[PDB]
mmCIF file of all heavy atoms in Angstrom:
data_model
loop_
_atom_site.group_PDB
_atom_site.id
_atom_site.type_symbol
_atom_site.label_atom_id
_atom_site.label_comp_id
_atom_site.label_asym_id
_atom_site.label_seq_id
_atom_site.Cartn_x
_atom_site.Cartn_y
_atom_site.Cartn_z
ATOM 1 N N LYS J 42 156.041 146.417 97.347
ATOM 2 C CA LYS J 42 155.786 147.787 97.680
ATOM 3 C C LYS J 42 154.290 148.019 97.767
ATOM 4 O O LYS J 42 153.806 148.635 98.747
ATOM 5 C CB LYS J 42 156.333 148.789 96.593
ATOM 6 C CG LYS J 42 156.383 150.203 97.166
ATOM 7 C CD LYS J 42 157.220 151.029 96.252
ATOM 8 C CE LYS J 42 157.609 152.380 96.760
ATOM 9 N NZ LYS J 42 158.577 152.913 95.773
ATOM 10 N N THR J 43 153.577 147.512 96.750
ATOM 11 C CA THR J 43 152.137 147.646 96.653
ATOM 12 C C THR J 43 151.413 146.984 97.803
ATOM 13 O O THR J 43 150.501 147.566 98.399
ATOM 14 C CB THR J 43 151.573 147.168 95.297
ATOM 15 O OG1 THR J 43 152.297 147.865 94.218
ATOM 16 C CG2 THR J 43 150.080 147.550 95.163
ATOM 17 N N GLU J 47 148.927 148.680 100.725
ATOM 18 C CA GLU J 47 147.592 148.152 100.913
ATOM 19 C C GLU J 47 147.382 147.611 102.292
ATOM 20 O O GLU J 47 146.340 147.787 102.863
ATOM 21 C CB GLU J 47 147.396 146.991 99.901
ATOM 22 C CG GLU J 47 147.124 147.472 98.491
ATOM 23 C CD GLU J 47 146.952 146.377 97.487
ATOM 24 O OE1 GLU J 47 146.862 145.221 97.874
ATOM 25 O OE2 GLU J 47 146.917 146.677 96.282
ATOM 26 N N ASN J 69 160.631 143.680 87.334
ATOM 27 C CA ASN J 69 159.180 143.652 87.385
ATOM 28 C C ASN J 69 158.659 142.433 86.703
ATOM 29 O O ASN J 69 159.009 142.227 85.572
ATOM 30 C CB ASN J 69 158.575 144.892 86.658
ATOM 31 C CG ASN J 69 157.084 145.092 86.910
ATOM 32 O OD1 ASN J 69 156.258 144.301 86.441
ATOM 33 N ND2 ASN J 69 156.717 146.148 87.600
ATOM 34 N N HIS J 71 155.902 141.768 85.229
ATOM 35 C CA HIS J 71 155.068 142.018 84.045
ATOM 36 C C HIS J 71 155.866 142.364 82.849
ATOM 37 O O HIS J 71 155.387 142.158 81.777
ATOM 38 C CB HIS J 71 154.051 143.083 84.314
ATOM 39 C CG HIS J 71 153.107 142.688 85.399
ATOM 40 N ND1 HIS J 71 151.920 142.012 85.145
ATOM 41 C CD2 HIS J 71 153.224 142.752 86.753
ATOM 42 C CE1 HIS J 71 151.339 141.708 86.287
ATOM 43 N NE2 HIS J 71 152.094 142.167 87.272
ATOM 44 O "O5'" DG Q 1 151.450 141.363 95.489
ATOM 45 C "C5'" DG Q 1 151.864 140.068 95.131
ATOM 46 C "C4'" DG Q 1 151.005 139.492 94.028
ATOM 47 O "O4'" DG Q 1 149.866 138.794 94.572
ATOM 48 C "C3'" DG Q 1 150.455 140.477 93.004
ATOM 49 O "O3'" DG Q 1 151.169 140.394 91.787
ATOM 50 C "C2'" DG Q 1 149.066 139.959 92.688
ATOM 51 C "C1'" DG Q 1 148.726 138.912 93.740
ATOM 52 N N9 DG Q 1 147.614 139.373 94.557
ATOM 53 C C8 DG Q 1 146.467 138.693 94.873
ATOM 54 N N7 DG Q 1 145.642 139.391 95.601
ATOM 55 C C5 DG Q 1 146.281 140.607 95.771
ATOM 56 C C6 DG Q 1 145.876 141.772 96.487
ATOM 57 O O6 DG Q 1 144.838 141.961 97.122
ATOM 58 N N1 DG Q 1 146.831 142.780 96.411
ATOM 59 C C2 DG Q 1 148.024 142.675 95.740
ATOM 60 N N2 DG Q 1 148.813 143.750 95.772
ATOM 61 N N3 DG Q 1 148.407 141.602 95.065
ATOM 62 C C4 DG Q 1 147.494 140.614 95.122
ATOM 63 P P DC Q 2 151.228 141.620 90.878
ATOM 64 O OP1 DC Q 2 149.987 142.277 90.938
ATOM 65 O OP2 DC Q 2 151.713 141.190 89.624
ATOM 66 O "O5'" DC Q 2 152.311 142.550 91.574
ATOM 67 C "C5'" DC Q 2 153.735 142.303 91.556
ATOM 68 C "C4'" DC Q 2 154.479 143.561 91.158
ATOM 69 O "O4'" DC Q 2 154.007 143.938 89.860
ATOM 70 C "C3'" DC Q 2 154.208 144.745 92.088
ATOM 71 O "O3'" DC Q 2 155.522 145.207 92.473
ATOM 72 C "C2'" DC Q 2 153.683 145.845 91.188
ATOM 73 C "C1'" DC Q 2 153.792 145.317 89.794
ATOM 74 N N1 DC Q 2 152.736 145.605 88.828
ATOM 75 C C2 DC Q 2 152.984 146.555 87.837
ATOM 76 O O2 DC Q 2 154.057 147.157 87.844
ATOM 77 N N3 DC Q 2 152.029 146.815 86.922
ATOM 78 C C4 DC Q 2 150.884 146.138 86.944
ATOM 79 N N4 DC Q 2 149.984 146.409 86.009
ATOM 80 C C5 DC Q 2 150.607 145.159 87.938
ATOM 81 C C6 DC Q 2 151.552 144.927 88.853
ATOM 82 P P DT Q 3 155.750 146.440 93.425
ATOM 83 O OP1 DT Q 3 156.984 146.305 94.074
ATOM 84 O OP2 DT Q 3 154.601 146.615 94.184
ATOM 85 O "O5'" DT Q 3 155.896 147.711 92.474
ATOM 86 C "C5'" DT Q 3 156.981 147.938 91.535
ATOM 87 C "C4'" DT Q 3 156.865 149.306 90.889
ATOM 88 O "O4'" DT Q 3 155.751 149.312 89.988
ATOM 89 C "C3'" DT Q 3 156.629 150.420 91.906
ATOM 90 O "O3'" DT Q 3 157.702 151.274 91.484
ATOM 91 C "C2'" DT Q 3 155.379 151.137 91.449
ATOM 92 C "C1'" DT Q 3 154.989 150.482 90.141
ATOM 93 N N1 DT Q 3 153.602 150.217 89.711
ATOM 94 C C2 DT Q 3 153.187 150.876 88.574
ATOM 95 O O2 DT Q 3 153.865 151.701 88.006
ATOM 96 N N3 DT Q 3 151.951 150.512 88.115
ATOM 97 C C4 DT Q 3 151.100 149.591 88.679
ATOM 98 O O4 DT Q 3 150.010 149.383 88.167
ATOM 99 C C5 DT Q 3 151.609 148.917 89.858
ATOM 100 C C7 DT Q 3 150.759 147.888 90.529
ATOM 101 C C6 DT Q 3 152.832 149.239 90.289
ATOM 102 P P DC Q 4 158.207 152.517 92.276
ATOM 103 O OP1 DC Q 4 159.610 152.454 92.346
ATOM 104 O OP2 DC Q 4 157.461 152.681 93.470
ATOM 105 O "O5'" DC Q 4 157.828 153.736 91.337
ATOM 106 C "C5'" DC Q 4 158.431 153.943 90.059
ATOM 107 C "C4'" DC Q 4 157.685 155.003 89.273
ATOM 108 O "O4'" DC Q 4 156.377 154.513 88.965
ATOM 109 C "C3'" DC Q 4 157.491 156.329 90.005
ATOM 110 O "O3'" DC Q 4 158.248 157.157 89.122
ATOM 111 C "C2'" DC Q 4 156.027 156.678 89.810
ATOM 112 C "C1'" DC Q 4 155.408 155.514 89.062
ATOM 113 N N1 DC Q 4 154.144 154.899 89.495
ATOM 114 C C2 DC Q 4 153.038 154.971 88.644
ATOM 115 O O2 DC Q 4 153.129 155.617 87.599
ATOM 116 N N3 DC Q 4 151.892 154.354 88.992
ATOM 117 C C4 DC Q 4 151.833 153.658 90.121
ATOM 118 N N4 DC Q 4 150.681 153.071 90.427
ATOM 119 C C5 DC Q 4 152.950 153.552 90.999
ATOM 120 C C6 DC Q 4 154.081 154.157 90.635
ATOM 121 P P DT Q 5 158.431 158.732 89.310
ATOM 122 O OP1 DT Q 5 159.554 159.092 88.486
ATOM 123 O OP2 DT Q 5 158.367 159.053 90.720
ATOM 124 O "O5'" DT Q 5 157.125 159.374 88.694
ATOM 125 C "C5'" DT Q 5 156.749 159.137 87.352
ATOM 126 C "C4'" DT Q 5 155.340 159.623 87.116
ATOM 127 O "O4'" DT Q 5 154.397 158.703 87.685
ATOM 128 C "C3'" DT Q 5 155.041 160.993 87.724
ATOM 129 O "O3'" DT Q 5 154.835 161.812 86.581
ATOM 130 C "C2'" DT Q 5 153.677 160.854 88.364
ATOM 131 C "C1'" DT Q 5 153.289 159.396 88.175
ATOM 132 N N1 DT Q 5 152.652 158.601 89.233
ATOM 133 C C2 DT Q 5 151.458 158.015 88.895
ATOM 134 O O2 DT Q 5 150.941 158.152 87.808
ATOM 135 N N3 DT Q 5 150.894 157.248 89.879
ATOM 136 C C4 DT Q 5 151.401 157.009 91.140
ATOM 137 O O4 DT Q 5 150.793 156.288 91.915
ATOM 138 C C5 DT Q 5 152.663 157.650 91.427
ATOM 139 C C7 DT Q 5 153.285 157.448 92.771
ATOM 140 C C6 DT Q 5 153.215 158.414 90.475
#
Side-chain angles (χ1 to χ4, degrees):
Chain J
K42 196 166 191 172
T43 307
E47 283 179 9
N69 192 291
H71 298 270

